[PDB]
């Protein structure tokens, strides 16, 4: 059986079908993914200019779908016709994503003030100074351009982006665990749910949450020299003792206790369910599956960070080419030729290549997250006696 799908729901249903099937009682996160995959893809990458233009083109296609119904699409156009709603939602999310990134039309733009971020004091001192720049005013709608888009601000900004992606992956894992718990409640197991899902969930969740809370505490304390590597430095010693950099006064003993708790819970993820089954009367796949899934979530976060960095680099390259064309063209013709060439190249790179790569990566991350979460394939589609030509 299949849940009824509207015009917008059809793409999510198709995605769920790609991720195998699920039982009628089995939870189907397809509706949730219909926003999550746009939510992740927006976090993954996005260009404000072409993305808005791509969204406008998709909306025009949706408006003209009446003719597109008559005019049979070809190859990827057919898939686009079905996925118009999902693409529009993804572009809408990417709009806010670019707003956060502040690279409007793949270029930083001032927000509210004449300059969104500036350098307080150091009037004569160069940007490469001890005082350097002070952001007395910070951009309220997006990252401060001085602190992010500037020449030397790139490394710290990238580290912060990677750290945030780690937290986003932790949140995705938590959502998967929550979905698993909900589906188990739907499965209505008297004690098997507590014996199996509760230990499999929560354990790795808190394992990653320790690092996420460490990141939050670092953001509160604002340590500088370690940059985003303070967490790496802290976790570098799984053994006890030391822990000088620990922001929480008791973070060391608490971390040791948490490590012991995780070590104890590790068999609890695998042992209770087969024991209950034997008492009534796979786990081997579940073995190492938790570590593999945590590694996969970290990989997804790193992939998102890398995709964002690559998008920023491509935007910088396009802006540099445009600036070079404009500055070195006293005559109108040279500037026009350069602008046209740069526009064509940037469109091809971003709207096609970068967009497809980001979509594929986001889809793969979504499949990994869903497979970790639930629904384990194992089903088929609703089978009516519908006339294919008529319907």
């Amino acid at each position: 059986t299949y849940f009824r799908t509207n015009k917008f729901t059809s793409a999510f249903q198709e995605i769920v079908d790609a991720y195998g099937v699920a039982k009628y009682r089995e939870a189907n996160p397809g509706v949730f993914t219909i926003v999550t995959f746009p939510f992740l893809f927006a976090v993954m990458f996005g260009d404000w200019g072409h993305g808005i233009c791509l969204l406008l083109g998709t909306l025009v296609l949706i408006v003209r779908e009446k003719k597109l119904a008559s005019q049979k699409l070809d190859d990827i156009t057919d898939m686009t016709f079905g996925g118009r709603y999902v693409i529009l939602m993804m572009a809408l999310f990417s709009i806010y994503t670019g707003l956060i990134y502040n690279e409007f039309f793949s270029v930083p733009f001032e927000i509210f003030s004449h300059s969104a971020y500036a350098c307080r004091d150091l009037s004569c001192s160069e940007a490469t100074t001890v005082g350097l720049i002070k952001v007395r005013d910070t951009y309220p709608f997006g990252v401060d351009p001085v602190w992010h888009g500037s020449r030397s601000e790139l490394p710290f900004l990238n580290s912060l982006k990677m750290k945030m992606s780690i937290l986003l992956g932790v949140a995705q894992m938590n959502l998967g665990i929550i979905l698993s718990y909900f589906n188990a409640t739907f499965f209505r197991i008297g004690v098997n749910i507590w014996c199996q899902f509760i230990p499999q969930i929560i354990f790795l969740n808190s394992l990653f949450g320790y690092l996420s809370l460490l990141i939050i505490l670092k953001w509160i304390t604002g340590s500088q020299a370690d940059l985003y590597h303070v967490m790496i430095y802290m976790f570098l010693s799984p053994t006890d003792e030391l822990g000088d950099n620990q922001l929480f006064p008791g973070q060391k003993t608490a971390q040791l206790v948490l490590l012991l708790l995780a070590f104890v819970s590790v068999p609890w993820m695998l042992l209770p369910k087969p024991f209950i089954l034997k008492m009534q009367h796979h786990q081997m796949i579940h073995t190492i599956e938790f570590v593999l899934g945590a590694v996969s979530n970290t990989a997804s976060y790193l992939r998102l960070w890398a995709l964002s960095l690559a998008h920023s680099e491509l935007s910088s390259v396009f802006y540099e080419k445009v600036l070079l064309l404009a500055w070195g063209y006293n005559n109108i013709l040279i500037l026009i030729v350069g602008i046209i060439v740069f526009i064509f190249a940037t469109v091809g790179v971003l709207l096609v290549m970068e967009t497809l790569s980001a979509f594929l990566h986001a889809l793969r991350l979504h499949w990994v997250e869903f497979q970790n979460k639930f629904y384990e394939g194992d089903g088929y589609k609703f089978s009516p006696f519908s006339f294919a030509l008529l319907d």
Partner: peptide, 27 residues
Amino acid sequence: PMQLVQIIIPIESAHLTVSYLGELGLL
């Protein structure tokens, strides 16, 4: 939220029901 169904329908009437359910149908 579906379930199996079983029925016995005369062939002559079954033709009309099948024709009606051809486009979309249930089972």
